[PDB]
Structures are given as structure tokens and as C-alpha cells.
RNA sequence: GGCGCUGCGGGGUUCGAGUCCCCGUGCCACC
């Protein structure tokens, strides 16, 4: 249909009715009251001060602006102080700040320097004020637009930067309106975006370069998209290309995820013949932005050991649920040979090559292309024992948190018994089933 | 604090690690 027509009914999904801006109004206004009774410098900013925020995603973010003078730590705490005194619910999350609410409304409260301009650059903290000035007026009367890319970006599951999505993040998304100048021009133009894209805003041109790359206005030397995943940006121009190809409001709803009978499942596997099988530890008391990077570096930790054992591993995945964390991985081998050959040194190397016959072994050693080899034998011929022995001896290497869990506690889980854990979507996803 | 890319060292596997495995500026961080 009418593409126009797709679009105004997707500022439905995307933008908040007045019941909820009438929330945030009361808020921001009862805010301000408690925080000028005080006497203290602060400045909205943030995609509320902006009238950006997606639909249900709202969020008053305030920062409070202090002068140079008293520098180090001797101004972090003390905005702590201002914090839970204008918040009715007080609670510091992890460089510190105050979480909390007013009327309802989520609100974060932020220290951070007043500065000069953008060159005293040292905390990078010390950027969102700047970057809310250098949005406040190029974004006024694009409001809808920039909310449009976001409901696009989050019904797709690659809106926001932080480690769990490694996708857009909303300044970002900002920069890419005021850049295009809608959310349209922005879809139809990121078809023809490369791995080696330069998008500069300030300079208002494209480039080619080492990687995809977005100039921060505020700072050349930095990358807006410096945490945009090389997979998730091709997943948006994949998802650009589509769009423009067939429009559809679908683009802007959620996918739910592919249920599916563990009995079709086990048929699946059986019929890849591949070996399929978890590794199940208690989950650390972490963060997100802690525990993602964790979870994704002992998964490629026990990828790279699968692939050295020769197990040839096709993809991993994990998944955090409440009480624990799920490393799910997929083999061409469900069993090796029980022997494997080791090399040994040339022959002409008449000490080395001594030491090498020295050690005893069920069967004899042999020259080949002028070197001495052996058989000998694995301390494992399924990748669950090599997977088992690796996690037992290299904990330590998996991650901080997670290793540490590991360390303690973990199993691997695999056959019929994997499908009754929380993991079916995963599962999937990474087999590539489809129904 | 966590992860990532480098640099300098100490161990492990091995007949033999400049090389393989482990150990002692950037990103997300409310940027
Ligand atoms: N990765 C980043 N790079 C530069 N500036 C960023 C940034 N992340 C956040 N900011 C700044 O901090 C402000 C608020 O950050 P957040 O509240 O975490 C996301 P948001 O801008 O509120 O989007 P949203 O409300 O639609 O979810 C942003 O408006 C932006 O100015």
C-alpha cells in the first residue's frame, strides 16, 4: 500500500498519547520545583527534553552541572546527596548516579563538570549536554521521525547500544534523521550503506573509510556507532531493502518468538545429525552490561576449544534467564577417534629426536616427510567430555563473574534433556528453524 | 566495575613456544 499511509499508522505504535506525556509534564515540572530549592545547577536532557522518547520507553534524565573547581571525587558523592533528596525512591546503580522515580515517571540523576566547550573532553560523562545542544534545535519539528527509526530499530531487536543489543542507540538515531532529514530518506539511503560507510553529519557529506563509522559532531575523533555490531548492521540494511521492497506495519511489531514441540525438536536434531548441548551455571548478581560481554566471551572461549579439538562447532548462542545462564552450541562431530597423531621433531635432530621415542605409547612411532610422529591418545571423544574438561580446568579464563560461577558449579546438559531447559528460542534461532 | 584491541613480563602444553593455552587506549558504562 501507500507507503505514506504505512507510516502514519506506525506514529501510533511509536509516539505517546497525552495520558502518558501528561505523566511526564507533572514530573518534569514537580522536578524542577524541588531542584530550584535547592539552588543547585542542573539541565534536562535526554530524548524527553527533546520530546523523542519512544512510546512506553519513557524516561527523565536530568544532569547536574558543577563547576571544575572542586574536581576528582570531590564532587561525586556529593551530588548524591541532591540525588535522593528531589527522588522519592532512592537506589545507586553502577562512575556512580541515582535511579529513581517522580510521580511514577522513571528518572536518572547525573553529576558531571560544566566545562567550556567540547575540548575539555576527558570524562566521558561530560558529552551528553553537549550532545543535547547540538540536537535541541536540528531536531526540532523531526520529533516523529526520530521515533519512528526507533520503534523500526526496537521491533527488530537491534535499538539501543548497550551490550545485551549492540545496535542503534538513540543519539544515533538522532544524528541519522538530522542527517537524512526523515525516517524515509534514512531507510532508503542505509540500502546502499557498506562495512566501510563514513556518515559525517557536522561536514554533511559521506565517505569511504576503514569501517562503518559515524562522526560525533561534538567530537571527530569518536564513533557514534562504535558499538553498532558489523551483524546488526547488516541485519538494518537487509531490513532497509526489505522494507522498501513490500512495506508493511508488521516492520514495526514485535516478533514473537517460534514455539515449538520438543518432540519435532529432537526429530530436527536427529535429522542434522549434529551434536547439540548446553553448558548450565547459576547466573552471577550482575549487570546486564557486566554479564553480556562475559556470556559472549566464554561462549567464543569454548567455540575456539571446539574448533582445536577438531569437534568443528557451526554456531553458538546463550541465553540469561532469572537463576541461570545457557552456552549453547551445535557440532558436526558427535565422536572422534579415540587416537590422534602427534608431531614430532626431524630426524637429523639426534637429541630432541631421542627425547620424543623416550615416552612409552601403545604403538610405535613413525617417520613421515622427514619428521617423527606418534599416536597417541585423547582425554576425550565426544565434545560434552572435551567441553566438561575444559570448563573445570579453564574457568578462570571465562570470564570474571561467569568463570567464576563455572568454578563452582556448572553441567552440561545435551540429548532430550536440553529441551525441557528455557533455551527453545535459542535453539532455534541458531539452527535456523522455521515454521 | 565488566568486556574489547595493543604493549611489557611470569607460567602451562610440548622433543622444542618470537608463534599455541593460561596468568599479572577504546566500548557499554545515566557517556
Ligand atoms: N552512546 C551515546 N553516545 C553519545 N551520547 C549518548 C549516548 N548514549 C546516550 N547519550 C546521550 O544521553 C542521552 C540520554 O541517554 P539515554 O536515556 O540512555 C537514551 P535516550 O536518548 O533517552 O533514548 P530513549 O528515551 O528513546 O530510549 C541521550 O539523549 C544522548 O544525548
Redesign the pocket.
Given at each position: 500500500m501507500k507507503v505514506e499511509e504505512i507510516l502514519e499508522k506506525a506514529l501510533e505504535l511509536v509516539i505517546p498519547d497525552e495520558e502518558e506525556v501528561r505523566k511526564g509534564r507533572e514530573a518534569e515540572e514537580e522536578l524542577r520545583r524541588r531542584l530550584d530549592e535547592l539552588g543547585v545547577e542542573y539541565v534536562f536532557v535526554?530524548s524527553y527534553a527533546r520530546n523523542t522518547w519512544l512510546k512506553g520507553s519513557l524516561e527523565i534524565?536530568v544532569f547536574l552541572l558543577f563547576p571544575e573547581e572542586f574536581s576528582k571525587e570531590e564532587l561525586r558523592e556529593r551530588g548524591l546527596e541532591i540525588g535522593k533528596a528531589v527522588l522519592d525512591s532512592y537506589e545507586i546503580?553502577?562512575?556512580?548516579?541515582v535511579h529513581g522515580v517522580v510521580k511514577g515517571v522513571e528518572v536518572?540523576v547525573?553529576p558531571c563538570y560544566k566545562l567550556k566547550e567540547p575540548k575539555n573532553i576527558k570524562?566521558?560523562?561530560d558529552?551528553?549536554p553537549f550532545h543535547h545542544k547540538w540536537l535541541e534545535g536540528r531536531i526540532k519539528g523531526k520529533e516523529n521521525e526520530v521515533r519512528l527509526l526507533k520503534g523500526f530499530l526496537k521491533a527488530n531487536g537491534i535499538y539501543?547500544?548497550?551490550?545485551k543489543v549492540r545496535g542503534f542507540?538513540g543519539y544515533l538515531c538522532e544524528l541519522l534523521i538530522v542527517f537524512y532529514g526523515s525516517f524515509l530518506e534514512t531507510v532508503k539511503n542505509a540500502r546502499r550503506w557498506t562495512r566501510r560507510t563514513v556518515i559525517d553529519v557536522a561536514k554533511g557529506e559521506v565517505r569511504k573509510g576503514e569501517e562503518f563509522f559515524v562522526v560525533d559532531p561534538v567530537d571527530e575523533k569518536?564513533?557514534v556507532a562504535?558499538?553498532l555490531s558489523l551483524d546488526n548492521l547488516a541485519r538494518f540494511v537487509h531490513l532497509c531493502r526489505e522494507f522498501m521492497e513490500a512495506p508493511s506495519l508488521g516492520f514495526f511489531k514485535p516478533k514473537h518468538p517460534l514455539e515449538i514441540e520438543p518432540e519435532r525438536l529432537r526429530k530436527i536434531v536427529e535429522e542434522r545429525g549434529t551434536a547439540v548441548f548446553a553448558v548450565k551455571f547459576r547466573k552471577p548478581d550482575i549487570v546486564d552490561?557486566?554479564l553480556y560481554?562475559?556470556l559472549?566471551?566464554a561462549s567464543?572461549?569454548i567455540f575456539?576449544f571446539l574448533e582445536?579439538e577438531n569437534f568443528m562447532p557451526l554456531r553458538s548462542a546463550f541465553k540469561a534467564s532469572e537463576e541461570f545462564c545457557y552456552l549453547l552450541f551445535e557440532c558436526q562431530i558427535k565422536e572422534i577417534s579415540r587416537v590422534f597423531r602427534?608431531?614430532?621433531?626431524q630426524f637429523e635432530?639426534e637429541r630432541?629426536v631421542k627425547?620424543?621415542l623416550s615416552?612409552n605409547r601403545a604403538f610405535r612411532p613413525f617417520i613421515e616427510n622427514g619428521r617423527w610422529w606418534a599416536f597417541e591418545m585423547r582425554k576425550f571423544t565426544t565434545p560434552e567430555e572435551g567441553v566438561r574438561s575444559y570448563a573445570s580446568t579453564?574457568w578462570?579464563?571465562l570470564?570474571?563473574?561467569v568463570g567464576e560461577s563455572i568454578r563452582e558449579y556448572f553441567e552440561i546438559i545435551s540429548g532430550e534433556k536440553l529441551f525441557k531447559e528455557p533455551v527453545t528460542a535459542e535453539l532455534c534461532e541458531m539452527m535456523g528453524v522455521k515454521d
Open positions: 535526554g534524565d546503580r553502577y562512575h556512580p548516579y536518572d547525573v570524562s566521558a560523562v558529552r551528553t539501543g547500544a548497550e551490550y542507540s569518536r564513533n562504535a558499538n552490561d557486566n560481554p562475559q559472549e566471551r567464543r572461549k575456539e582445536r602427534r608431531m614430532g621433531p635432530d630432541n627425547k620424543f615416552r579453564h578462570h579464563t570470564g570474571k563473574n
